[PDB]
Amino acid sequence: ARIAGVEIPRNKRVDVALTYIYGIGKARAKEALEKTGINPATRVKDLTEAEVVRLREYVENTWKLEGELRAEVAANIKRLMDIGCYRGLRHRRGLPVRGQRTRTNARTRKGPRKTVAGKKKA
């Protein structure tokens, strides 16, 4: 099922499958079958060619997805980046942005640990 931007989720349940798309989560999915009538309990493989299209044409003409989201965000980041925006700076430095601490647990934004030397006391 070549749904959404170049993607093919398959052999799995419908409601799960969609999750696989950049724009679709465990919310939009169930709300994209409620709007169709397709019973999520069925597998992608057991879809009526028709059933399939309905999905496609919906999904694409409404929610931004991969081909277009990864863009809006990318540039959205640059938005404040271009301006002397605090939040921006945090983006340049590769630190937390939403307001965390930089003395400990922040390894998710920095990644591997960069161990430096210290000094004696004994």
Residue 68 or 86 with smaller CB distance to another protein: 86
Smallest distance, RNA to C-beta of residue 110, A: 5
Smallest distance, RNA to C-beta of residue 6, A: 14
Residue 52 or 80 with smaller CB distance to another protein: 80
Smallest distance, another protein to C-beta of residue 84, A: 5
Q: Are 45 and 63 in contact (CB under 8 A)?
A: no
Q: Name the binder of 69 from another protein, RNA, none, CB < 5-8 A by kind.
A: RNA
Binding site for RNA (CB under 7 A): 12-13, 16, 19, 21-29, 41, 69, 72-73, 76-77, 79, 86-87, 90-91, 93-104, 108-110, 113-116, 118
Tokens found for residue 118: 């210290």
